[PDB]
Amino acid sequence: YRSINAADLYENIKAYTVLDVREPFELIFGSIANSINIPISELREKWKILERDKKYAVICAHGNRSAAAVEFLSQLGLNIVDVEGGIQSWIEEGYPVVLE
């Protein structure tokens, strides 16, 4: 189990592949660019779609759901990290978000 600051993620944004585990209706209000969306209610059945050769940054609205996802994918041998504060923190700190 590892964690990553917002500033850290943004500075290394190209080194990570943001995994947004929030529900789809939540992304219409803003999401980090190119972040793949897998709701925690599907993560169990569709985590196989995740690349092993990638470094994932799991984001949540506040971090409660991302934390649980990390503990799950971490034991499956995936290189993933939890994003502190969720996307809420990301926005509070003034970071770029997409309306897509």
Domain residue ranges in the chain: 1-100
Rounded Cα–Cα distance for residues 37 and 47 (Å):
11
CA dist list (Å): 63 to 51, 52, 53: 22, 23, 24
Residue 98 to residue 81: CA distance in whole angstroms: 21
Other C-beta atoms lying within 10 Å of the C-beta of residue 54: 14
End-to-end CA distance of the chain: 30
Resolved by: X-ray
Task: Report the half-sphere exposure of 94 (CA within 13 A, side-chain side).
Answer: 0
Superfamily per CATH, domain 1-100:
Rhodanese-like domain (3.40.250.10)
57 with 16: CB under 8 angstroms? yes
For 53, residues 6+ apart whose C-beta sits below 8 A from its C-beta are none
